[PDB]
Structures are given as structure tokens and as C-alpha cells.
């Protein structure tokens, strides 16, 4: 199956002044981001505001991104839904419009009953029925749960489950996942630029990083430094990405990411309600996280 | 606007052996539950597996429940979605098929950015555009977040926001909400039978209780004892509902609730994947929580 | 053994300008607090800054309080240490200087290994070797842990373990503890004034309340209203104590409590380092919590 | 001031069958551990059961360890107490019996009031008054709190605060601390062997690792591989230390560590109550974590 190693920005969904998906701005942004040596794009991931899109919007976004992308760049499409059957259908439909692989977030509304066995069954079914490879996706900042290690190890054995994006930032956990799945075809990607160097050191083979929407060359440079054994230079660059990374993830989220996109000359624009614009104090804090690290 | 005081079971969604909504079993269960002096039914709440239904299923369930209900029983319909615009549309559509009021869960996927201001704006918009009264719904066991008190107080002032269901079980918080909204038309309902007596003592005026799907007469009796000042008898009954309540909520959730429904002669049946059947050990623990408190 | 029902303030330790224990101010405060119909005093509890005192100070504080107290008021002395053997020795020494009962906080530094069995063994040993009755004390805001219900139930069977102070504010948990220990001589006290009415409703028989250091008559009035079935008046008073209670506990802690003591004419004075004075903003917020509820 | 870079085991306190400190077994263990190229010993750290020792035992343990140690090995002594004044006195007394530096755990009982300012003031005072260099110590598994980054950065400026041991395992946080204190004389040590390689990659210069009590050569080898740029071999070794490290820290704690010490031929022996022996199931799980990684 495919090779998912490398760097991807999880791309945003631009909206118009009336909250419609702005496909013109989407295409413009993607053409700009195309200049960086990314493996591809993560589309309708958390940073894409997928919970705020209709079924049909979610599908058409994947379809349009496929058209604005080179054939040899990998389209990793967010197809995860709460129900297993809905996830199957979304995964099939996204494959049909050209997704190379399906990145499937853990169901999480019923967190108390999302046991290892439940999650194993969910992902096994999706992987069984998906015409494209499946990538597991654990993101406790949004879901309140880690996909358990025992479940990851079991799932890594499935022929159609090719890797995972872990956004939790626990490199002891990530190291253990790499180690325990070493006999399988199973590639681990970091879910943020803040712990990317450490992830590479522990055996992860790339990153899906919101920060790459604005510092794409720097995140790719970090990958290069890690892959060529330049760990001292990698350290220095990694250090300077920590605060800007926190700014567009844990601190200010997608509103922070879109604001910084605006300031860098991309179309950031509005989020969909209930997400709101940053307060002036938040804007200033966001600015400082970039300026004090030499990026703005 | 309506008076929402009283007891409601948040009704389940029965499914067939092929995971389709079983409307026959739904109607049969509702006719049975109709015998208890509930204020009404909460439909497509958390216990209804609403995240696992399609838009259309969610709507048709509300429509069918309205048909199987007396006109003077209150249909409180779960219309909450992640996006504000989707919530508006679902709320309008549910009103159109006969919902008396809309119970609107807090958006929660982007928990880090669900500030008081964001949630205020979300609920204000929905309440502005809803043709039926809005009931706030805070359930941190599923969402990972409490609707903040300051937001509740602000929202209580809206003419079209008539109350709240709090499932968090913090009676200091609930007491404070009652106290701070005392000048408004704003009725608080407990979200579980485990803290119902204490909620009444603090000024809540009812409960939406999963446990009422199986111990409806007992939950209604508890209401009666609290409303008539029989606090000593209320205490004894409340004590005996704690473990059975924990069993069908925090311990074993909807799978536990549906299993106990089966054992009591209702149609419990299967959950939709990814929810799974109880393990034999879990079944036994569930059984013990009911038997040791004299209910089975 | 004794009857521990009723209200107690957990008294502070006054310090001089040079951080020495101010026994003169201690005696003056206690004589003032003696006017309220408390069951007694909780001495060297969390609000007494016991972790900041030497062994000898902790003992001499209990000794001096005993001298400044009526013989028929109950001295409940905080004797809990991390180690079981140290707890035994402190409990014996405090008994020797006149403590009526020992209130024993859960060891908590090694929280990951403080299992039910470990805590059962700890309290069983202390109760075995203590010449005075033992009161369990669970306070997760300071310890990060709840004494587990199964451990409480087992321990309630010990002839020398006569009750518990629970500060966690979970009235479902407290209701369950009352219910499961109903066959034992085991009295439950709430650990704060914020959930006192609900605690009484669920079968607790009193409260150890930091707030009683400044609103002693009001907390005692609340007890009276609960014990005489005046639940409607109890509700109104309970509502008005919630914010002032939060102010001197979860919001501003002992520095908040001592500041309000100053403002009410008691000696509040300084805490021992590392505790610090309130910032001006914190002072103002503290003031507002009291003034907006009609107490200042 | 000293150079604290390198590996240290935080040594245990052996106890006799009657719970007395077994200084004979302590000396025997230390002589054995002396064979590894550690920088020194961490004495009366968390793994030493310091909360369970008397003042005098804590002091005499440091004194005896100093006697059983080479003059050129660094004695890093745990002198942290809840109160600032007690910490000062313990730090001075430990210096007097030969400690090279004082490792000072964050006060944590009053966690809600342990603000950055409070912790800054606490450590500034201790560092002002200590005749030996101070090492900050953050260990949220035991304290429930992280020493905040802003406080660490401020404190790193003090001439007598020479570094920190962080046990929290968050390499984004550790990377940020290294980066923000880069202009100061301030050395960061990892607090466990599970994230040691990643810590080195991010700019930490050593580790205080419970695991080094039993796999001292392996932890030192890991240091060597990181310091010589052998990251591929470092990865493989780091992977194999993760589960054994979890076993003697987060899973089974000091009882697990002492049991494995027994099995490796050291004196592990009993913990002080309330710590208990492992259950047979826990013993078996501990065994498996070592055997499945090739260490036993
Ligand atoms: K695979
Ligand atoms: K209203
Ligand atoms: K007893
Ligand atoms: K320094």
C-alpha cells in the first residue's frame, strides 16, 4: 500500500462572508502550499472544521482538493464519524472522489464506552470495508481520549491499516507504539510540529502539522534535518517552532491559525460559528509568539 | 412559554438486527412509558444515540415520537449540532414535526475554543432563530466541558431560553445557577436520577433521567416526595437509586441501559456500532447494582 | 464513642510578623468563635496550615486550643501524616494533650499506590493504635485523591472509626457512603459550607466548614434549618453562602479566609510561606463575593 | 557552581523487618551502584520515600550516603518541604552533612494557591539562603502540579539555581524550558528513563532515573549513545527501556522498583506503610515488562 511518510499540512476550510465554503480561496491557498515538499495534504482533518460541514460539503471539499493537487501528492482525507456505518460510507465516498487514504478520528461522544475492544471493532470494520488504506487518528485535545496502545498494536496487524497520526504529544507513548508495531507495516506521524523532532528520534516518519499551513518550509526543513542526522541544527529549529506551534494549536486553535494565515498572505478568513474571532489580547499574544521566535 | 418542570426519560433508539431504527419497538416502548406521570419525553438526547443517526433518521424519530405521544405531554427534542447554523436548521426542522422545545447540547469538538462568549453567541443565535423554546444542555461526561455559569446566567435572560438540563452532578454549581437566574424565567432540570433529590433541594424543578426508562414509577415517586416535603422518605428512595443509576450512566452507559430494559420487559436491544454489548462480567455487575438495591 | 454530629470551624493558625505561631491571637479568635453553637473545633486541619508547622508546633497548638475550649466542646485534631507509623505517633501525642478525636487525612504523595487496600491498612492500623476515635478525611482539592467508597465502607466497620469528613462536594458519592454504612456507627460530615444543605438532605449529620470562621452564626442557622425540616428557608440561606464559600476555599483558599477574617474583626493575619497575600484584584473579587451576597 | 549533567539513580531507603532504616543494606546497595558511570546519587528524592522518614532520618541518610560515596561523585539531596522556612533549614542541614546540591520539590498540598509567584518566592528564598546550589524539581505524578514554565525561566536567572529535574515527560515543555533558559547557567535533567533520549535530543543534559537502580549500565549506555550522536542505536535501546521504566514508575512505583531490585540481587526489601507489597498479579505484570524486553 502507499507510503505515508513525510509532512502534511491539515488544510483549513476557507469560508465566505456568508459562511459558505470559499472554493476559490481554497484552490488559491492549495496552489501556494503546493510549493513546499509536503508528502501531500490532510483534508477535512480537525483543522479543516469538518464537524461544521455538511456531509456533502465534506465530500466536495475532498473532490475539489483532489483536482487542485498533483497526482503524485497524497490526499489523506478525514472520513471519521461517530458511528461505524457512517464512517464506512464517508470513507467509501471519499475514496470515490480520489482520496488516497482515510484518516479516521476515534469516535468519542460516548467516551466512557469507547473501550479498546470497541475501537478495535470500529477500525477493523472500516478497514475491512474501505477501498483505500486507513490511518488511525488519536487527538485527545478534541476527543478527550487516547486510542489505547493495545488497540493500536492489534490494529497495526490489519493489512489495510497502514499507520497513525498521534496528536497527544507523549513521546514515551509514541516510542512505545513504534516499538510494539515494529513487525508490522505501520507508519507513525506526529500530529503537531511542537514534538516533531522528538517523534522522529523515537521512530515516527513524519508529521501532520497545522503549523505547516504558515511555516511550511521550516517544518519541511525540520524533517530534512532529522532525516539526515543533523540533530543539533534540528534542535535549534525545533526550539523556535514550539511557541508558534502552541499558538495555532493549544492556545488559539483554528482562529489563531487562520489569523496567522491572513498575516502571512494566505486566505485565513473566518471560522464557522460557534468558533469566534480572537480578542485583541489574543491577537497580540499570537503575534508575540511568532515575532519573539523570529518568524514575523 | 411552556413549563418544563417534571420528570422525563431520555428515550432510547431501538435498532433492528440489521441496525435500522425499529419504529415498531420504539412505539411499543413509548406506549409502555406513557403510563408514568412524566412531563414528557426527551427524544434524541444522549441516551437516544443521536450522534449515530443520520439527519433524516433524527428528524423522523422526533416525528414518530410526536405521533405516539399525547398532545399534552412535552416533546423535548435534541437538536444540538457542532455548528451553529446546523443547530438552527435541525431545531427548525424538529419544531416543524412537532417538538415542543429544543434541548441543545454544547458544541464540544473544539473544546479549547468553546469559551463562555462562544457558547453565549451559539445559544443566542439558536434561541433567536428557533420557533420553539430552547433548553440548554450541559453533559461533561460526553462533552468534556461544563457550560460555564457566567454563560448560563447571561443566556437565562433570553426570552426564548427557558431552562437547562445539567448532567454534571455538582449541586454546588446547580444551586448557584438556580440562585443567579432567580430573576429570570429559567427552570433547571437534573440530568440524572443519582442527584435528583439534592437538585430539588437546591431549587431544580425536575429531571431528565436515563434511569426513568426502567424505574419510571420510582423516579416519579422521588419527585413526589421532594415536592411534598417528604424528605426523610425521599432520602431512603434516593439512596436506593444511586447504584442502579450509576450502572446505566457512568458505569455501563447505553449498553447497560438497554440490557436492563431487556430484563424489565421493554425492548432494549442493540446499540449502533461502535457501541458494543456488555461483557459477561459487566452484565453481572449491572445485575448486582439492581438486585442489591431491591429492584430486580 | 463520641457523637461527632454538628458544625465545626477548622480553625486557622495565626502567625506573627516573624512567622511564629501567635498563641495570643489564637486564643482571642477561639474565645470569639466560642460564642456560636458549634459542636467543637477542628484543629490542625487543612485550614490550620498543618503542613507548615513543625511536629512540636502542631502538638502545642492542639494543647493550647484544648485549654481555651470548654470541656464539653469536641476537639477534633488533625493528626494525619504521610507514613502510617508517624500518623500513629502524632495521633497518640494529640490524644495525650486532650484531643477528643483524630481527623486523619489520606496519605497522598504516592497517589498512584494509595489503593483501597493500602488506605484500608493505613486507617485500620491508626484506629487499632489510637486511644481516641478516628475520623476519616478525604479532601481531593489538596490531595488529588478521593478515599474510595469501598475503603470507606470497610473502615466504617471498625469500632474505633466513627465517621468521616468529605470535602469533595459530590453528593451522589456522599449519599452512597451514608447508604452503604447505614448499619454501622459512622457519621458523615460535609467538608465545606457550599454543599452543606444537600449533605444533610442525603444523610450527613454536620459540617467542618472553613466558612464558619467568619459566618459561624449563618452556618449554624443553616444546620438548624436543615435539622428542623425548614428546607425552603435552608435553600435561600444555602444559596447565599455558595459564592462566599467558594471565595475562601476553591478560589482564594486560606489567604482569602484570613483576609475575610481581618475584615470581620478577627485576627486573620499572614499565612506561612509559600502561601502569599492576595493580589489587589483577588482582594476585590473576594470582597465582591461577600458584598453581593449581603454579608459585607 | 557544580556541573550537574549526567545520570543519577534516585536511591531507595532500605528498611528492616521492623521498618527501621537499614543502613547496612543502604551501604551495600550504594557500593554496588558505584560501579556505574553515574554523575552521582540523588538521595531522599521521591524514590527514597522521604515523606515517610523523620527529619533526623532524612538527614542521617544523606550523611551516611556521603560517607559511602567517592568525593568526586555528586550528592544531590532532596531537601524540599511544604513550608519555605522548613525547606531552608533542611537544605542548610543537608549541606552541613555533605550534600553537593539541593533538589527541591515543589510544595503542593495547597496546590490551588501554588501560583507562579508563590513558587518563584519559595525557590528564590531557598536559593538565597542555601550554602549549596539549588536544583528545581517538578514531579506532577506525585504533586499534581507542574512548576510553571514562566516560574522556571525567572528562577533560572538566580546565581544559586543551577538546573531542574522534570519528571512530567512532556518533551514540548522540556524543549521550551531549555530554549527559554538558554542564556542562563541552567541544566535540565529528565526525571525518568522513559523519555531520556527525547530529552537529550531537546537539550536536556542528563537524567535522574529510578530505573538506573536496576539497569544502571543500560541507562548510562543510553546517555553515551545520545552524547555521541548514535541516535539509531539510542532509539533501539530507548524502546526497550520504556515498559520496564513504566513498571517501576507509573505502574507499580517504589514497591515495583524494590521488587525488581530484589530479583536483580540488590536489597529492595519492604517499603514503609502505607506503601504495600505488590499483589501476585502485579508481580507477574512487573516480571513480564522486564522479560518481554530482554532484561530478565
Ligand atoms: K498494517
Ligand atoms: K428566559
Ligand atoms: K464504626
Ligand atoms: K542560574
Residue numbers in the entry:
A (entry chain A), B (entry chain A), C (entry chain A), D (entry chain A): 32 to 327
Provide excerpts from the study.
4-hydroxy-2-oxoglutarate (HOG) aldolase is a unique enzyme in the hydroxyproline degradation pathway catalyzing the cleavage of HOG to pyruvate and glyoxylate. The crystal structures of the apoenzyme and pyruvate-Schiff base intermediate complex are the first for any HOGA enzyme to date and reveal a tetrameric structure composed of a dimer of dimers as well as the identity of active site residues. As mentioned briefly above, the crystallographic symmetry of the hHOGA crystals generate a tetrameric assembly containing a dimer of dimers. Residues 26–259 form an (α/β)8 TIM barrel domain, while residues 260–327 form a three-helical bundle at the C-terminus.
The inclusion of 10 mM pyruvate during crystallization improved diffraction substantially and allowed for in-house data collection to 1.97 Å resolution. An omit Fo-Fc map contoured to 6.4 σ shows clear continuous electron density for the imine Schiff base adduct between the ε-amino group of Lys196 and pyruvate. In this binding mode, hydrogen bonding interactions are observed between the hydroxyl group of Tyr168 and the O(1B) carboxylate oxygen atom of pyruvate. Additional hydrogen bonding interactions are present between the backbone amide nitrogen atoms of Ser77 and Asn78 and the O(1B) and O(1A) atoms of pyruvate, respectively. A network between Ser77, Tyr168, and Tyr140' from the adjacent monomer is also formed. A superposition of the apoenzyme structure with the pyruvate adduct (RMSD  = 0.19 Å for Cα atoms) reveals no significant structural changes to the active site other than a water molecule within hydrogen bonding distance to Lys196. The crystal structure of hHOGA in complex with pyruvate illustrates how the highly conserved G-X-X-G-E motif fulfills the same carboxylate-binding role via two backbone amide nitrogen atoms. The Schiff base intermediate observed within the hHOGA crystal structure and the inactivity of the K196A variant support that this residue plays the same functional role in hHOGA catalysis. The crystal structure of the enzyme in complex with pyruvate has enabled the modeling of the HOG complex and led to the identification of key active site residues. No electron density was observed for the first six residues of hHOGA and the three residues remaining from the affinity tag. The final structures for the apoenzyme and Schiff base adduct exhibited Rwork/free values of 21.2/24.6% and 19.6/21.6%, respectively, and were of high overall quality, as indicated by the refinement statistics in Table 1.
